[PDB]
Amino acid sequence: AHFPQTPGFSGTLRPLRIEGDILDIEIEGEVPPQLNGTFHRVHPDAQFPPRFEDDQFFNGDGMVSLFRFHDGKIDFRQRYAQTDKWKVERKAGKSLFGAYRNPLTDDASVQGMIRGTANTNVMVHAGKLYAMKEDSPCLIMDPLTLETEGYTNFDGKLQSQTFCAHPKIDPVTGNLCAFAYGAKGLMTLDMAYIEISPTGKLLKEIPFQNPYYCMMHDFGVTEDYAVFAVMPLLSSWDRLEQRLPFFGFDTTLPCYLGILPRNGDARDLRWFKTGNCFVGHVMNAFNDGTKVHIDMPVSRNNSFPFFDVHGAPFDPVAGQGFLTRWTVDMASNGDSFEKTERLFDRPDEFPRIDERYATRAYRHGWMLILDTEKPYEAPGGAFYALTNTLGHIDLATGKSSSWWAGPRCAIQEPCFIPRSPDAPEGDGYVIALVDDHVANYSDLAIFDAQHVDQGPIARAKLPVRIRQGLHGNWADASRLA
Amino acid sequence: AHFPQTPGFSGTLRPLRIEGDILDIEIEGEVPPQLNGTFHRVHPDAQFPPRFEDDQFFNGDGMVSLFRFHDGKIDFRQRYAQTDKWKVERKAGKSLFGAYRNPLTDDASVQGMIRGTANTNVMVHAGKLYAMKEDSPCLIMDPLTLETEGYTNFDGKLQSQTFCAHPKIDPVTGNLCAFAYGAKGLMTLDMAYIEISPTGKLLKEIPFQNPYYCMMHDFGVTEDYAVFAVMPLLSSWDRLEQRLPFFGFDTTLPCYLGILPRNGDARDLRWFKTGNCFVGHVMNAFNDGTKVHIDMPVSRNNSFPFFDVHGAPFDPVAGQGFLTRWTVDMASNGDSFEKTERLFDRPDEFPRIDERYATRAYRHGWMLILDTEKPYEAPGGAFYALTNTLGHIDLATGKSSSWWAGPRCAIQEPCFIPRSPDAPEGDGYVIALVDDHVANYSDLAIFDAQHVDQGPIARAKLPVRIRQGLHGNWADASRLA
Ligand SMILES: Oc1ccc(/N=N/c2ccccc2)cc1
Ligand SMILES: Oc1ccc(/N=N/c2ccccc2)cc1
Ligand SMILES: [Fe+3]
Ligand SMILES: [Fe+3]
């Protein structure tokens, strides 16, 4: 139809809205022949024009992309996640749900429905594909056909209304370790830590309470504890009644770090306190005894202009997040941090690890780098959320390498793949969508994990440019059993 | 995975190979709200890399695109035509058939199979979609789902092995009027004129003989006769044994024009003779009494670099085709033409008419114009087959108007739609795919048929660039019953 001619739908953020398939993608170079598995990712892509022309980036319907690696070939499939919102709006032929996380602006016909778009994360678990959005239950899809089974409550057991979009895989038990904030509705302090068995059965749902009505986007999991970074990105029902953005960052309130024993309950929860800041995605987290470390980009204010926060608009310099380790001790009194240490001196986000070392001690990480010292010759805005560099950091030595995508391209969230099941940490490949904004083409580029500076060793050249996405994951073919 | 790095697969001729859908295409401007129907077109698009790195453009598997118009909205669907070749090659995962129209280069596993790609024309008839390739029978598909039913012989009646890709619709009887060359196999002089009832039943299959083993791509149909333009674009089994392109244009042999009474047989066929030249697509053809006129672009040699002709590579100046009327008389003795008259002074091809006046006297025509005096700012060659202008000609007065697509875009074969069932000749709309080769985007542009100079009145903006195609047709929704 007629989408708004606003910057949110023009330029590189133009609507895509195409589901389809491609058999045997064009390959420049050679795909690692031993690779055999599935790479899932997802982007927001409103099926119809929004009700309000200022609709946020995070409110678009979820479009899931599957790249199946097998025998040096890559197949492409892309489908809409058939959420309840998507089904009802397709039947209606127009957009019925309102602004981001604002049910006071919804149409009367869909009142009370699950407003999730499942546009934030996609991960293969328990033989199915979990599609996740923070404000809604987990949606279940087929990993290979991308058909939508629908929202789940895990055989009826799960009591929480929501389900996070950043679960971690326990590298010993294979359990899905997730959480949920706003578990009893919007603007509710209820929280839950959740563990799902490798067969999809809910194992534990430990409830507790949160310091604020704040966004809990990501969290950490260690061998013994679950870590929750609480930042004062607040929400107010009063502010929703005033037709303002749902989230809004208070620069006066402090930040908390909640450590919960995985085999405990809310009584065992310990809160630590630190200065005001903005926390991003958790690279990893691990515990040495009672010492708990968590790694994440920290910044003064909004870490991405995709967020529409209350107050002043985007501050491009205060939003620079740097990879930082927070260290608390469960063996100490009080609520004081043991250490905060900046790990990387360039503004970065979307961190990644060798997922085999999740929850455990590690050293190799990959990230997107916002390099402003580089030119950008593409008309159509989008200079601010421009993640144009891919970087690899060795945390054991501080050495780092990087790779620039040129003045035409941007990069999406990378993902690591091991060379062999029992290969050294970070020994393998890093894949990521590189987007040429001049020619409008997307390459699934594959780098050497240890030599990302050497550029890609292979590119799966697509005949279309995939829209700006969020998170994706790799799963070996064996996980489809 | 690895396509040849030749110009035939690089630049604007890159492989597309994406089947998919788009619900409610982005519309710049307004689509005529009364329009309700289907626009089908098709382009070559080899599913896998070829067996020979010099594969021609016409040898790629057929990719069919449907634009459904309804209530001012347009939906997009695109699917592979599942020919026997396509199915067997997908089962094999690689290309099994050899060079263009050369079974001597095929793999042993597909010997005897139908090597058609159904990549030349797609037209709605008898409630189904006929997908056509000159060297193979007609393929039957679903007009709305683009599902493939398969090759047909029309309840077993049709004796011809082949089926042309340029059928004409009788504006009185509703019959599909087609022909066939090589009807008894490759390199056979056997020809057939064919009529299919509006319910799909074979009505006539009148066989005759051809002057040469030559390409019969298009033909004419009048109220009383069928017209066959014979040009010495020859093929030889020797030429296949010598691993040469299937076709090769002899500049020494003459051209013929065969007029056959539609309700007659081979004895009634009359051949007329004229000088050597190259004939293109038939705009229209009609008879006034015994006088028979046919309109088509004529040129010295190869009219498009899509063809690989024997001898020297493409000559862009000898290849300029001009719309020309040939006129013979069935009441005169001998084989002399009554008149040959050039109707349009600019190099043109892909002509189109108000199909309501097919086989009858007419005046309004549309065409693609090769305007070489215009700039073209796209890197990657392809300055030669650049159809950058859309033109409308009034044959009753010789007046003509045109429209340039700019230095970034090219145009594909247009198609006419009447404004209303009872509108004057050429009163309506002209639709065509305009392709931005710098940004790689395709718009289904809609013009006023009488004021194409006023630019498009609407654009269905796609988030992808459709490959260079061949022929398409429009069908009202009523024809889907
Ligand atoms: O529904 C949601 C909710 C939160 C959300 N955060 N994204 C980001 C992206 C980058 C840094 C920090 C947060 C995205 C979608
Ligand atoms: O399979 C085929 C066979 C013939 C063919 N001719 N195209 C043209 C195009 C322009 C002028 C004359 C012929 C196209 C595809
Ligand atoms: Fe995120
Ligand atoms: Fe043609």
From Swiss-Prot, chains A, B:
GO terms for molecular function: carotenoid dioxygenase activity; iron ion binding; lignostilbene alpha beta-dioxygenase activity. Activity is high with beta-1 type stilbene and minimal with beta-5 type stilbene. A 4-hydroxyl group and trans-stilbene structure is essential for the binding of substrates to the enzyme. Inhibited by N-benzylideneaniline-hydroxy and -methoxy derivatives and N-(4-hydroxybenzyl)-3-methoxyaniline but not N-benzylideneaniline. Fluorinated olefin (Z)-1-fluoro-1(4-hydroxyphenyl)-2-phenylethylene is also a potent inhibitor. Imine linkage instead of ethylene bridge in the substrate enhances the inhibitory activity. This is Lignostilbene-alpha,beta-dioxygenase isozyme I. It comes from Sphingomonas paucimobilis. Homodimer of two alpha subunits. The keyword Nucleotide-binding does not apply. The keyword Iron applies. Fe cation binds at residues 166, 217, 281, 471.
